[PDB]
Design a protein around this ligand. Structure first.
Ligand SMILES: [Zn+2]
Ligand SMILES: [Zn+2]
Ligand SMILES: [Zn+2]
Ligand SMILES: [Zn+2]
Lengths: 69, 69
């Protein structure tokens, strides 16, 4: 039905929100500290000196274990 | 259709996995450091001395901004 297409789109948008904002290929699993933006996979987070959301300096990267992983 | 029911269930299960493991009511937005388990809302994470998943000592709590929020 049309509701199947609407639900497929909601699922797609939610799955895309879980993907790294830089590479768009791997699941987000890393937090920039101290700002707390959690938007990258470990490989892109290792290569950024500034947060790509707020531009604050990255003092270190915290790995995050989420239940949805 | 039955396909619509299947997609509704996937969406529901994903949204339920995003809720605090202690209160089951608020969105997960906090990480226990250094272990990295990200399973609680701010209020439930604030008083735990040890991680509820792995029993490691909680040195501090890092707030996380998640794009799925
Ligand atoms: Zn990446
Ligand atoms: Zn930031
Ligand atoms: Zn809670
Ligand atoms: Zn832990």
């Amino acid at each position: 039905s049309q509701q199947t297409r609407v639900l497929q789109e909601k699922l797609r948008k939610l799955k895309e929100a879980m993907l790294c904002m830089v590479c768009c290929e791997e699941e987000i699993n890393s937090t920039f500290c101290p700002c707390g933006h959690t938007v990258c996979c470990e490989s892109c987070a290792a290569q950024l000196q500034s947060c790509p959301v707020c531009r604050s300096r990255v003092e270190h990267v915290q790995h995050v274990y989420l239940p949805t992983h």
